[PDB]
Design an enzyme around this catalytic site. Structure first.
Site, PDB file in Angstrom:
ATOM      1  N   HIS A   1     -44.503  -2.002 -21.299  1.00  0.00           N
ATOM      2  CA  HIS A   1     -43.458  -2.895 -20.811  1.00  0.00           C
ATOM      3  C   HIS A   1     -43.867  -4.331 -21.088  1.00  0.00           C
ATOM      4  CE1 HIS A   1     -46.421  -3.159 -17.519  1.00  0.00           C
ATOM      5  NE2 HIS A   1     -46.002  -4.412 -17.487  1.00  0.00           N
TER       6      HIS A   1
ATOM      7  N   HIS B   1     -45.668 -10.543 -23.774  1.00  0.00           N
ATOM      8  CA  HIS B   1     -46.484  -9.587 -24.504  1.00  0.00           C
ATOM      9  C   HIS B   1     -46.346  -8.198 -23.880  1.00  0.00           C
ATOM     10  CE1 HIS B   1     -48.995 -10.500 -21.021  1.00  0.00           C
ATOM     11  NE2 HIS B   1     -49.578  -9.334 -21.240  1.00  0.00           N
TER      12      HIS B   1
END
Ligand SMILES: Nc1ncnc2c1ncn2[C@@H]1O[C@H](CO)[C@@H](O)[C@H]1OP(=O)(O)O
Ligand SMILES: [Cl-]
Length: 174
Positions: A41, A123
């Protein structure tokens, strides 16, 4: 009852599968601890330990967010040695993503949560406890997809595994 909570963007299965396939190819077991496919995620904001009253209030502010959907294309990869992670990301994150994160981050701040103290670097973490430096290839081709919502997750560790439980979801573009 307090919980470790965070807002996050998720990944379609097709792309989650392409990522773990790419990872296994370029990163051997010794390279680090591989994040479970379902745990991949992109965090928008880490809230930390939060009471129910504050969860309620945060959940409401998030509900006040009114922002169009946007597209993510993962063209970048890298490694932060201090954090000991290998991550997937983007060279030029869409403004909509930045807007969404800062807004959620500012709502966390005004809600009395403890802030990153560091800039927001979007990220997706692939490997954890990757202490030693290793060669980072470019990501796979066409890891591009439409972001239709964001989710408040609860972080939980149990039975030797880290688990992310979704609590609430919010659509974008209203
Ligand atoms: N102090 C903290 N404790 C636990 N998780 C944190 C954290 N700060 C940020 N996070 C993020 O919260 C998410 C779930 O724990 C992770 O994606 C993690 O980002 P990371 O992947 O770069 O480590
Ligand atoms: Cl994991």
């Amino acid at each position: 009852e307090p919980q470790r909570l965070f807002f996050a963007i998720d990944l379609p299965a097709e792309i989650r599968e392409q990522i773990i396939h790419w990872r296994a190819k370029h990163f051997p077991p010794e390279a680090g601890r591989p994040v479970a496919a379902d745990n991949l995620h992109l965090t928008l904001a880490f809230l930390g330990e939060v009471s129910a009253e504050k969860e309620k209030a945060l959940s409401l502010l998030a509900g006040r967010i009114r922002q169009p959907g946007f597209t993510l294309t993962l063209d970048d990869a890298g490694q932060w040695l201090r954090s000991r992670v290998v991550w997937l990301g983007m060279r030029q994150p869409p403004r909509g993503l930045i807007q969404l994160a800062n807004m959620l981050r500012s709502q966390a701040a005004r809600s009395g949560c403890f802030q990153s103290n560091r800039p927001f670097h979007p990220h997706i973490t692939l490997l954890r406890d990757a202490s030693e430096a290793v060669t980072i290839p470019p990501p796979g081709f066409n890891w591009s997809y439409a972001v239709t919502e964001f989710t408040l997750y609860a972080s939980s560790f149990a039975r030797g595994r880290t688990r992310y439980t979704p609590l609430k979801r919010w659509a974008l573009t209203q």
